Design a binder for these strands. Structure first.
Ligand SMILES: Nc1ncnc2c1ncn2[C@@H]1O[C@H](COP(=O)(O)CP(=O)(O)OP(=O)(O)O)[C@@H](O)[C@H]1O
Ligand SMILES: Nc1ncnc2c1ncn2[C@@H]1O[C@H](COP(=O)(O)CP(=O)(O)OP(=O)(O)O)[C@@H](O)[C@H]1O
Ligand SMILES: [Mn+2]
Ligand SMILES: [Mn+2]
Ligand SMILES: [Mn+2]
Ligand SMILES: [Mn+2]
Ligand SMILES: [Zn+2]
Ligand SMILES: [Zn+2]
Lengths: 351, 345
DNA sequence: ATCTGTACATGTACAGAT
DNA sequence: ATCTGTACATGTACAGAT
DNA sequence: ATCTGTACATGTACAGAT
DNA sequence: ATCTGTACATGTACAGAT
């Protein structure tokens, strides 16, 4: 029943194969262009992230996320007004500086210009660059070989120092993945992507946001308290399956209802990270109990909506569901929709 | 009772501190000599190994193992007979015996250098132990004034795929898992100048892999961590090591046995019984008793396969006589059936 | 002659197809 | 249950640069 | 190239709580 | 007796400086 829904959401190998071949060609060509001698982005490296590379993409392989990450040694960070997530950042990049402050907007604008130039010279493939969207750190490619595929090329600064202080009590995996895992994860770099809002606030053009997309990918692919969870000599859990179901519920509601424009799949991802922390035992995600596991995720998400509280998993003081970011009305609208589907056998899964 | 024995075997923080301070001085000075000096071993790097660095040393901090590992440009290995563990090495040109990199020549120069440097140490009472023909180590004897031995082990580091003899080894797939096993086998492998029984042959070492396993020994990621549950795996290893050590002190008949037999056996047992709840501290007695039963079965079948190299039998007749295994069997069974009176010594 | 940034070589987990 | 395409970590060969 | 600084894992040690 | 919290000690991966 839920299993039949998962059957419908499963990607097909033929679609995967055809989509990846084209995405890989485009991305490699753009990455090579970035290495040309006079490029401010020479030395940028690729990191594939997001649902496709975590194996939780649903319905079709039609949206791919790729970070083009540039190491920026000897950075000093200044927190933007105690928000925990947003920072000012203070030589190939000297053209993007205003005094000692690195402009996210100048740097993103040049990045976009280079990508557009290279895209125009692709005659192989039907590909174009989507109009910039406010609040996005990405240059998005629209590929039509024939099926529509979007690729988000995300500009990111790489810093190898210790993670900012706002993350100190974040990543609360000690009871689940453990202390050695958390220590090792926090020794990896952290990333900053352009905030890129057009909201008339101070430093609009120069504000960067923390990204832990690499850490999140690791977690999704190494998600059990037991080392053998979902391995060929261990037991299958239903953690990724619950994430896929919850993502589908949101995707379906969002297609129908403009009232839900403020919500995105990262809200669901964040909520399930909290549930995986609350219920760390693999036996609490037994496949035989798929319905009750999905049901408890739903109940948890409803509580987050109704109490207006969903803390960023890495930055606990940052509340993704504050009234400042999302209206009461929107949260209540979504709450009623979720409770309806839950209590009437998920008719939206049949559409 | 077993817990009281463990209390006696526990190292004291003050002894640890005093022993490590002296060991670290001597080791650092030898490692530095191997460098800025125009030695064939320039670029050798330190890797601490064995029971002290795995936190399973018992009784006193009086025996330390250190590898001085040298990366060597793509070598070619030829298995010695079909021993699995021993190899001739081809492509430091000073250490060739017509094209083969001689374990004896290379170890001899290494040992010469260490001896020379040791003679110039004036602040610490340290000497080099007479060479043992079976040993890949240059062994130091420190009087601190307590007696401390340090094994400085020369090792070639190779970054290639592990040799074919290890293909079915490291059988951790059901315990630590496939990602762990794959990642482990992506690390280098080591060759130490332990001769086959000759002079040119080298032997495989996985001391780095063994150390990782002892530090990451649970099916659960949180085993023995501050937000997980304590298991009794290392405590059973300590107890079994002490039983062998005590029997070996009393009976010369047991000279062919060593702690690495016990280590190998418990690796096998941890693979057979992977679940952390099968090693609950409340069940220390049962756990130690099943380790004993397992070891007795290894003795009775004359079979103890190297954990990494399955065709290498540490209990073959060629290495250990039938009578020696039977002698040990009887001793172990006596201690087991009389409540371990040797633990009270 | 050597050095090297770039891309191929090797190996296998994950999960879809049969 | 087996077979099989993709992703990806790490080793290494080498055209072009020095 | 080498070396120090940081962070926190692994331990010992012991009082107070359970 | 064990568990839990704090203090005190060593080992170790790796960034950044030199
Ligand atoms: N607001 C945010 N805060 C932190 N990280 C974010 C974020 N938005 C996106 N990300 C990161 O960037 C990745 C890609 O984002 P999206 O493409 O928008 C979604 P997704 O996780 O890939 O699933 P989907 O594309 O199937 O909906 C996320 O997986 C997450 O790691
Ligand atoms: N026969 C062998 N084969 C492979 N590796 C061996 C070996 N003998 C010793 N080693 C490696 O070298 C390490 C140190 O060896 P030893 O000092 O002889 C023992 P130990 O494991 O340190 O315990 P112990 O010194 O408390 O008795 C071992 O732990 C192992 O990793
Ligand atoms: Mn995505
Ligand atoms: Mn995206
Ligand atoms: Mn030792
Ligand atoms: Mn030794
Ligand atoms: Zn799982
Ligand atoms: Zn444990």
């Amino acid at each position: 029943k839920l299993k039949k829904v998962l059957d419908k959401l499963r990607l097909k190998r033929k679609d995967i194969s055809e989509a990846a071949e084209t995405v890989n060609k485009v991305v490699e060509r753009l990455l090579r262009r970035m290495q040309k001698r006079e490029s401010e982005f020479k030395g940028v490296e690729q990191l594939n992230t997001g649902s496709y590379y975590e194996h939780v993409k649903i319905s079709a392989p039609n949206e791919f996320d790729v970070m083009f990450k540039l190491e920026v040694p000897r950075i000093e960070l200044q927190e933007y007004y105690e928000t925990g997530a947003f920072y000012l950042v203070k030589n190939p990049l000297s053209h993007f500086l205003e005094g000692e402050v690195l402009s996210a907007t100048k740097m993103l604008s040049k990045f976009r210009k280079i990508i557009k130039e290279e895209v125009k010279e692709i005659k192989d493939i039907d590909v174009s660059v989507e109009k910039e969207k406010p609040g996005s750190p990405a240059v998005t490619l629209l590929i039509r070989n024939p099926e529509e595929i979007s690729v988000d090329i995300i500009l990111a600064l790489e810093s190898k120092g210790s993670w900012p202080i706002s993350t100190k009590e974040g990543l609360p995996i000690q009871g689940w993945l453990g202390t050695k895992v958390r220590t090792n994860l926090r020794r990896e770099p952290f990333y900053l992507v352009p905030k890129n809002a057009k909201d008339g606030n101070s430093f609009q053009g120069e504000t960067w946001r923390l990204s832990f997309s690499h850490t999140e990918k690791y977690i999704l692919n190494n998600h059990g308290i037991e080392k053998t969870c979902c391995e060929s000599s261990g037991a299958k859990c239903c953690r990724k399956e619950c994430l896929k179901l919850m993502k589908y519920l949101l995707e379906q509601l969002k297609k129908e209802f403009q009232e839900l424009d403020a919500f995105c799949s990262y809200h669901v991802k964040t909520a399930i990270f909290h549930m995986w922390t609350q219920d760390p035992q693999d036996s609490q995600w037994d496949p035989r109990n798929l319905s009750s596991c999905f049901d408890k995720l739903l109940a948890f998400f409803l509580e987050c909506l109704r109490t207006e509280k969903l803390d960023h998993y890495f930055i606990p003081k940052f509340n993704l569901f504050s009234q400042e970011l999302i209206d009461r009305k929107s949260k209540e609208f979504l709450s009623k929709k979720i409770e309806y589907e839950r209590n009437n056998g998920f008719p939206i899964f049949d559409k």
